[PDB]
């Protein structure tokens, strides 16, 4: 049928070195189908052979707040977003006890603070807590979570 494409970006400032790591790995699902795709280092995704119809599109990534986009109407090839105006995803719904709870709150902050003020060579450092992937767990990572403190998935 059709191709559904677009761009996903994390909601925080990146650099040339960090962008290709943090923009990749978002899974975009067309709910109601078994069709998905993972974003590349430019944040770009492409899902082919999509049947015409109206869908919810769901976006997920470890340690990010899951997003749902309702009423995505597909009648032909469709671009959901652009490189200059991407869909933003909010980091800081952390895997705690091997599960995310769909809220960004104090527990998510406390999870990062378990390895506060470390860099990648430290044994205590965990790459998952380094939200902006700059090779350190510092106040920047904590403030990223604070951007959307007290929010849940329906607030997107």
């Amino acid at each position: 049928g059709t191709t559904v494409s677009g761009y996903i970006n994390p909601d925080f400032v990146t650099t040339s070195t960090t962008a290709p790591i943090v923009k990749a790995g978002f899974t975009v699902e067309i709910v109601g189908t078994t069709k998905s795709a993972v974003t590349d280092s430019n944040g770009y995704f492409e899902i082919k052979d999509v049947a015409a119809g109206t869908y919810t599109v769901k976006i997920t990534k470890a340690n990010y707040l899951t997003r749902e986009i309702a009423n995505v109407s597909v009648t032909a090839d469709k671009e959901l977003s652009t490189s200059a105006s991407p869909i933003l995803m909010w980091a800081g719904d952390m895997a705690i006890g091997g599960t995310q709870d769909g809220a960004i709150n104090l527990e998510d902050i406390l999870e990062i603070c378990k390895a506060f003020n470390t860099s990648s060579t430290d044994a205590k450092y965990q790459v998952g807590l380094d939200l902006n992937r700059d090779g350190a767990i510092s106040l920047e990572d904590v403030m990223i979570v604070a951007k959307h403190f007290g929010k849940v998935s329906s607030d997107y």
């Binding site: 106040l139 990223i144 604070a146």
Partner: protein, 168 residues
């Protein structure tokens, strides 16, 4: 830059056993929401202590609060992760409920943010500075300041190092 972060001492002389209060202060930092600073001192000359009680800092001791960052409505959090054997302190305090903070239309931009104590172990000339850390990738001479949108302030302020202690 008339916007700055600095450290000020209540006094720059000290007999053995006396405590110098070192206050971290900011001036005209727009929509300021938090700091992190990395400080280097000489641990054989100065001992990091609580500025009111004189109790020795451990590697998890927290900085004493100043004028700013103490409105409980914005959910402040504070951290201390040091290497006292190397004379390194790392201090951080910030607001978490940034949307509430913005809604007040009342930014904190100038004033004191932290106080640490230094007890003289020796009466001997010594230097305290803000210092680069690998744990703070984009630090500006060992400092990272943030605004109330949760973004790092990447330019427009000076880091003013304090004067010498016990110079003669």
């Amino acid at each position: 830059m008339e916007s700055y972060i600095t450290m000020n001492f209540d006094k720059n002389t000290a007999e053995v056993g006396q405590i110098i209060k070192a206050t971290v202060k900011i001036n005209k930092i727009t929509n300021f929401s938090g700091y992190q600073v990395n400080i280097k001192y000489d641990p054989t000359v100065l001992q990091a202590v609580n500025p009111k009680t004189g109790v020795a800092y451990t590697n998890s001791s927290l900085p004493t609060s100043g004028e700013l960052l103490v409105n409980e409505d914005y959910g402040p959090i504070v951290q201390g992760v040091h290497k006292i054997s190397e004379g390194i302190l790392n201090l951080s305090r910030s607001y978490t409920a940034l949307d509430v903070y913005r809604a007040s239309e009342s930014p904190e931009e100038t004033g004191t943010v932290a106080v640490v104590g230094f007890k003289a172990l020796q009466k001997k000339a010594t230097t305290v500075v803000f210092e680069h850390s690998v744990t703070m990738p984009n630090g500006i001479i060992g400092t990272t300041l943030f605004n109330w949108y949760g973004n790092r302030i990447t330019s427009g302020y000076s880091v003013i190092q304090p004067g010498e202690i016990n110079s003669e």
